[PDB]
Structure formats: structure tokens, C-alpha cells
Ligand binder design. Sequence first.
Ligand SMILES: O=C1[C@@H](NS(=O)(=O)c2cc3ncccc3s2)CCN1Cc1cc2ccncc2[nH]1
Ligand SMILES: [Ca+2]
Lengths: 234, 51
Amino acid sequence: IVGGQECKDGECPWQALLINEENEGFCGGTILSEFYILTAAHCLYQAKRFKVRVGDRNTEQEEGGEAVHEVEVVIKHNRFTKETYDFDIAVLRLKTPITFRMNVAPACLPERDWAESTLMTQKTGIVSGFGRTHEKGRQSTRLKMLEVPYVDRNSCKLSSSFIITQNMFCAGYDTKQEDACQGDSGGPHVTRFKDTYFVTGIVSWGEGCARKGKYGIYTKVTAFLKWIDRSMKT
Amino acid sequence: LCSLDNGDCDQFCHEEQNSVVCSCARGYTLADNGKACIPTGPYPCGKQTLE
Ligand SMILES: O=C1[C@@H](NS(=O)(=O)c2cc3ncccc3s2)CCN1Cc1cc2ccncc2[nH]1
Ligand SMILES: [Ca+2]
């Protein structure tokens, strides 16, 4: 995350991290329930073998609440397309259930219509992760969070150099040096409504990170709510 | 209706038969006032952890 602040104790409990064979995080995830993690389908190509760590806030000091979980099933969207990042969504069923505690809790799944009219019309959403703090920097050691305004679909479609399918949306700033980045991918985009956070997006991609005239592109979770529900039963 | 302050609902709002009906995410129970959402157990979804 470029800019923004680090998540303080218990502020981003739904944050999950996908870690590779060498224990380094390469993508993010969102805790949907004790058995399911919502991530980006394009991350499943980032590493051969990987696990999901939860309750982590400082990858440089075992604070106690951390918990590593093996992945039992990887449910990638059948229509995901590598060349364009379309249908960038995947659900992970864990071998063992996540025990909710401080810094380990799920994000709420909203209902499509209500989310699109009420949640996505909010001024802002919240993106978070352990991803780079600079376009060409190193991954972050501390979990960070950034308030990213929702971007008008057209101003966003116009700004992008690649096709913004109906399965994605834009968020972030036009010029302000604040934006998700590499490593944050697959991570959560949540919108707060009356002190309860609802998952509204999956960090998908972007042209660089926090570049001017460019925004952050997220997978439109509201367009895959029926899909998520079915994947969390198989 | 639901366009007016979310229909007074804590969470989901749907306009049925020209009326407003509130509902909640899995893990919550609609309060007796049919608007508020009460958590079913500990660590309900969408809530930052305090203990
Ligand atoms: O800079 C970049 C991107 N390269 S490109 O601009 O040439 C793009 C080429 C491309 N081709 C097809 C669809 C979308 C793109 S974007 C790819 C990922 N990344 C790194 C990157 C990952 C990430 C996650 C969240 N926010 C910003 C982010 N930038
Ligand atoms: Ca730690």
C-alpha cells in the first residue's frame, strides 16, 4: 500500500496473506468465514505451493495472534482470463478452520443490489495489505490500510489503457500519491457502513502504482456474490 | 424508502410491496424493531476486534 496508514490493533482483522514456500507473502486475501478466503484468481499463478496466514500485522515479530493455514481447495473462476485480468476472483477452502480472535475476524458479504446502490456509492472504501509502499519498492513489513475514493466508471474507463470489463471497478486518486500496489493483490476492498465493514472488492491490478491519471482496479465483488455463495458450499 | 437513510436499517434494505424491509448479513439477527442487526455470536463479520 502506497501511503495510507498501518492497520492498528484489530482494525483489519479480515486481512489474510498468501505466503509461498519461503514464507514470503505474495498476495492478499479476505477472510470470508472460518473455512474460506477470498482472493484474486491471478494470484494462484504467482506461486506453485502456498498457504494462508491470518492475524498478522508485523511480519517481523511473532505477536501471537498469527495463524498459518493450509489450503485444501482452490476454487478459481472458470471464466478467468489471464490476458485481460477479467473475472479475477478465487475462493480458498482451508483444511483447518480459522479461530476468530483479536486481529482475526471475517468481513461481511453484502447483498448485490444493496451494496451497489448504498455501499458502492459511499464516498470511500478501504484497501489494505502487505504490498509495496512504492512502485519500485520492497513489500511492506507492516500491514497497511488506505481509504480510497470510489472512481466514476467513465472517468475511470477513460483513464485506463486497458479494457475495464463489467467485472471490475476503479478506486483511488487521480494524482494523489496513495494507492494499493503489487503484493496487495487479492487483498480486501471493504466499505464501511455504520461501523460494519462489507467486502466490496478484490485488489486486482493497476498501471504501476499511484500513477497520475491512473487508478486502482478492483474485481467487482458484487458481480460474483452468487458465485462466492456456491463456492463456499463446495 | 431505502433511498432515505437506508430505510433506517442497520444493514441490508429492500423495498417490498412499496414498503421497507431490513435484513442482516449471515451471523446477525434482525432486532425486534426489524431494523437493527444483532450479532449472533462472538467475532461477528465486519467488526473490528477489541479484545
Ligand atoms: O504495473 C502493473 C501492471 N502492468 S501494466 O500497467 O503494464 C498492465 C498491463 C495490463 N494488461 C492487461 C490488463 C491490465 C494491465 S495493467 C500489471 C501489474 N502491475 C503491478 C501492480 C500490481 C498492482 C496491484 C494493485 N494496484 C496497483 C498495482 N500495480
Ligand atoms: Ca507478526
